[PDB]
């Protein structure tokens, strides 16, 4: 399709080799493999295929997500290497992220990273989101499951399935979504900052599910009433406060992504600050 070729290179399939299946998505399988670049350098890639017998809607959605991804060239946003559309199966080829989805990676390593390592992950996510927001997009699905992490623990924003341009022109990830976006579809970069606060909690909780298994209706009611997720075990005060700030009821009082990046950069620059750690509550969620 022409739409995708504005922002995606058409790859020659002879330059793509497939190694093994590493996942499955809405649209088909995901494999690891290799791509030979025009310079003859070979790089590791992920290869997503559109399932045989796809509908035209599935093809548009599949390629549409690539068209959005291809608009971003940033170290903390998943890199699109290109697409294959002139032969079938249709393919999307992206940089390989050895350690997979961030939530599942952290669950394998409960309490095994240093606070500075976790802050490094969080800073990358924030930097990617700062660029995404600079580019006029709202992601709408920012969550640990939609961050990929590579062999050197660099985290990158992925999954542009719900993303859109902020303009005057389906199911929602309720637990990750701001109260105003739930209430009346008010999606802004500040609603992505809310979601970032949730990702911050997910990371400091080593991939615990936000609000655990609370019903979505209770998540909506509790959050609207002013309840918030409690501090993760051994969570630095600085980082819990950042969560609370991301979760301000008034979206205009939330920090911008640029401010989040700056905050994390200071914590990285002054790691002793992380040593001040965040008790008896009448409820599991904290009021305020």
């Amino acid at each position: 399709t022409q739409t995708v070729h504005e922002f995606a290179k058409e790859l020659d399939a002879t330059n793509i080799s497939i190694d093994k299946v590493v996942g499955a998505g809405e649209f088909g399988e995901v494999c690891s493999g290799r791509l030979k670049l025009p310079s003859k350098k070979e790089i590791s890639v992920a290869i997503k295929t559109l399932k045989v017998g796809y509908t035209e809607k599935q093809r548009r959605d599949f390629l549409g997500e690539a068209s959005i991804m291809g608009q971003f060239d940033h170290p903390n946003i998943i890199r699109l290497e290109g697409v294959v559309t002139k032969s079938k199966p249709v393919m999307i080829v992206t940089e390989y992220m050895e350690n997979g989805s961030l939530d599942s990676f952290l669950r394998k390593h409960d309490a095994q990273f240093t606070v500075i390592q976790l802050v490094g992950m969080l800073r990358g996510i924030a930097s990617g989101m700062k660029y995404l927001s600079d580019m006029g997009y709202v992601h709408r699905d920012l969550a640990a499951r939609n961050i990929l992490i590579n062999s050197n623990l660099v985290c990158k924003v992925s999954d542009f399935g719900l993303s859109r341009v902020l303009e005057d022109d389906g199911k929602i990830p309720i637990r990750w979504t701001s109260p105003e976006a739930i209430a009346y579809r008010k999606f802004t970069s500040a609603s992505d900052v809310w979601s970032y606060g949730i990702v911050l909690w997910e990371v400091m909780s080593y991939g615990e599910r936000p609000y655990w298994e609370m019903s979505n209706q209770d998540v909506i009611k509790a959050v609207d009433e002013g309840y918030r997720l409690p501090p993760p075990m051994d969570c630095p005060a600085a980082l819990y406060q950042l969560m609370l700030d991301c979760w301000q009821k008034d979206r205009n009082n939330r920090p911008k992504f640029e401010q989040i990046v700056s905050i994390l950069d200071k914590l990285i620059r002054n790691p002793g600050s992380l040593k001040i750690i965040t008790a008896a509550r009448p409820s599991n969620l904290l009021l305020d």
Partner: peptide, 9 residues
């Protein structure tokens, strides 16, 4: 984790 995405009823 089955109800990550949902409508509001």
């Amino acid at each position: 984790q089955w109800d990550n995405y949902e409508y509001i009823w």
